[PDB]
Amino acid sequence: LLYNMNDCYSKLKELVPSIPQNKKVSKMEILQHVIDYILDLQIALDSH
Amino acid sequence: DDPMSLLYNMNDCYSKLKELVPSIPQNKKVSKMEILQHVIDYILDLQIALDSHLKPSFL
Ligand SMILES: [K+]
Ligand SMILES: [K+]
Fold it and tell me: Per the database record, which ranges form the bHLH domain (chain B)?
């Protein structure tokens, strides 16, 4: 379960292939990679 | 640094996520944390969809 804000950002780092998990990344960068990743997943989904 | 400028841009990212994620109501304000929660569930769904169900080999 996602109980706090940091748990949410950390989860997103795991889920999004393009977000590095072994160097520092900003919250802002996380949001942008998440956005791009969603756009990619949606076009793939739409193909079906 | 321009603290508020970066915050407005983060805020823009949050608003975009509101558009992208179906489960999120757009004609209503939603907290940043709830937005990330909807985002996480939605990405998980899309992954399961694309990784398993949408495969020809899916049983
Ligand atoms: K990752
Ligand atoms: K929406």
Answer: 1-46
> Looking at the complex, does the CB of residue A7 fall below 8 Å from at least one CB of chain B?
no
* Minimum distance, in Å, between the CA of residue B10 and any CA atom of chain A: 6
In this structure, which topology does domain A1-48 adopt according to CATH?
A: MYOD Basic-Helix-Loop-Helix Domain, subunit B (4.10.280)
Q: How far apart are CA B40 and CA A8, in angstroms?
A: 8
- Kindly provide the resolution of this structure in angstroms, with one decimal: 2.1
b/e for B9-21, b at 16 or more Cβ within 10 A? ebeebbebbbebb
Residue with tokens 């169900």: B53
- Experimental method, per PDB record: X-ray
Pick the closest to residue B46 from B20, B28, B25 (CA basis).
B20
* Domain B1-59 CATH assignment equals 3.40.50.2000: no
